[PDB]
Design a protein around this ligand. Structure first.
Ligand SMILES: C[C@]12O[C@H]1[C@H](O)c1c(cc(O)c3c1C(=O)c1cccc(O)c1-3)C2=O
Ligand SMILES: C[C@]12O[C@H]1[C@H](O)c1c(cc(O)c3c1C(=O)c1cccc(O)c1-3)C2=O
Ligand code: NA
Lengths: 293, 293
């Protein structure tokens, strides 16, 4: 059944967060901001919303003016026909913080949002103070080397990477049924399932359960070829970079970031598989606070 | 019912085919047979049934006694807990044809059914007159080499190999919704969509639409590591082998069969992507008549 609105959710957090909207380049974005200090943009990924950062936002709000956004195609934000490449979505966020009167910001992103975080630093270095990448590197040529099958007992099948490439079938299969997808993902990541409760899962499922919302989600993934091409155009990132890697992705994240960025710092979230802000918020909040300063 | 019975479907075919059953080793298998002459076992794959051979069965029934089967886990056949490795499924079919009093049969299989067809020749050579593999080679180490992502225009996303590895999520997402799966597959293979009509698609969807049927289907794919292990133990087939390959699987199929078999013939289905019996039925019917003699 129904879940609380974004205003209800934002207000439920300590730190005085408010749910807001802003229109950038004709597209309306939802974000939740609060706290005081230098600006900190938080970007979530699939299939989640700004609410993915709930466990860390209050602590961060003590030091930063936190801006937690729904990406284009996500949650309360508009779901236009296109522009789901990370370069365009990063430009969205850039227009946003600039519209808010910020010349440069701290940026952290998770999952799809980490890609957007990287694209932001890549395309808008002057507006980028520091950037933190949570678990997920930007697409590059290595995306084409991902294997369909893992040998038994090794790693997790990244099935949704192939599946979300598809036209039509995803919304056809997943509409109304996104809670099952969320349950599968959490079942193959959380050390304790109670790390993300029923309500939290239902908030994501409700945001993604319509065919248009599923579809918008897939566009982030279908954009991968374009993202890969754009990535070839990026010079190395030279501002401070933070990579926070889960227990099984850490060394691959370190490799990619050290190759694509010149001032890289790494942190290992040893008790996490992927949903870092939810699996080890203590590590993410602490890492970001020490890193952004 | 939702669609015509297998009994109705069998009778609708010229050549006087009849739908039957038989129990082998506690597992009840459905098949449709007809015609006169030397026995010819026909094996379909995912997500199809014996009905996939409808366009060629009448032509073949004039020269061979055709036996078109639903595999274990498929269509009208039982769907037990296990035994979905291709070796076990081949033993099923061996027991079946021996129970019918045939010492040797010709064998042809497509898709998953082609793997079983190969396993049949491999494990029961004395019961194999000749064997034809339609498009799909038996699993080997190369399966761990399949790529999650294709460069644009470089081929189709083979997403279902990854997806069908999963526990629970496949039934949850696909039950009641297999028609959409079938449509996607046909949308990415048929040169003309009317090659497979609306009712035919619903016949397949109906066979697979319950959670148990989706699940049984995934077992064929989850057995892949075990199939790969079994393949390593096989000697070269020395009976006549025919490979019929689609325009894009041909050369891989030719490589594998020639390495695994000493008497190999190849045929190119130049206007087909994968569903050879439905896409180029005359080429298929014609090739089998020439090969089985
Ligand atoms: C872009 C994205 O594909 C999205 C997904 O959010 C993602 C990604 C990586 C994972 O390793 C990963 C996941 C994910 O949902 C997940 C669940 C369980 C285990 C696991 O390891 C993962 C990604 O970077
Ligand atoms: C075992 C199986 O995975 C099953 C599927 O039936 C299959 C297989 C190979 C394909 O290349 C292939 C398909 C398939 O449905 C399909 C549709 C569109 C393009 C295309 O190329 C394919 C297989 O071998
Ligand atoms: Na509010």
């Amino acid at each position: 059944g129904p879940v609380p609105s974004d205003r209800e959710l934002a207000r439920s957090l300590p730190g005085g967060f408010r749910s807001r909207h802003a229109r950038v380049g004709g597209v309306r974005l939802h974000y939740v901001s609060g706290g005081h200090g230098e600006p900190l943009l938080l970007v979530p990924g699939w299939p989640q919303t700004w609410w993915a950062y709930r466990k860390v936002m209050p602590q961060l709000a003590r030091r930063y003016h936190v801006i937690a956004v729904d990406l284009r195609g996500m949650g309360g934000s508009d779901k236009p026909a296109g522009g789901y490449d990370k370069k365009t979505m990063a430009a969205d966020l850039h227009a946003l913080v600039r519209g808010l009167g910020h010349r440069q910001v701290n940026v952290a992103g998770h999952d799809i949002g980490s890609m957007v975080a990287f694209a932001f630093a890549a395309n808008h270095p002057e507006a980028t103070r520091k950037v933190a990448l949570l678990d997920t590197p930007h697409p590059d040529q290595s995306e084409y080397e991902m294997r369909i099958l893992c040998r038994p007992g090794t790693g997790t099948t990244l099935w949704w990477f192939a599946f979300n490439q598809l036209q039509a079938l995803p919304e056809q299969l997943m509409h109304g049924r996104m809670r099952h997808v969320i349950d599968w993902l959490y079942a193959n990541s959380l050390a304790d399932q109670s790390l993300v409760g029923d309500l939290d899962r239902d908030i994501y499922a409700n945001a993604y359960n319509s065919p248009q919302a599923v579809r918008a989600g897939t566009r982030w993934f279908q954009a991968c070829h374009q993202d890969i091409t754009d990535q070839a155009g990026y010079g190395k990132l030279t501002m401070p970079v933070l990579g926070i890697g889960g227990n099984f992705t850490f060394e691959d994240l370190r490799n990619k970031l050290t190759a694509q960025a010149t001032d890289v710092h790494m942190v290992r979230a040893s008790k996490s598989v992927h949903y870092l802000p939810e699996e080890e918020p203590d590590v993410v909040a602490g890492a970001l606070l020490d890193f952004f300063g």
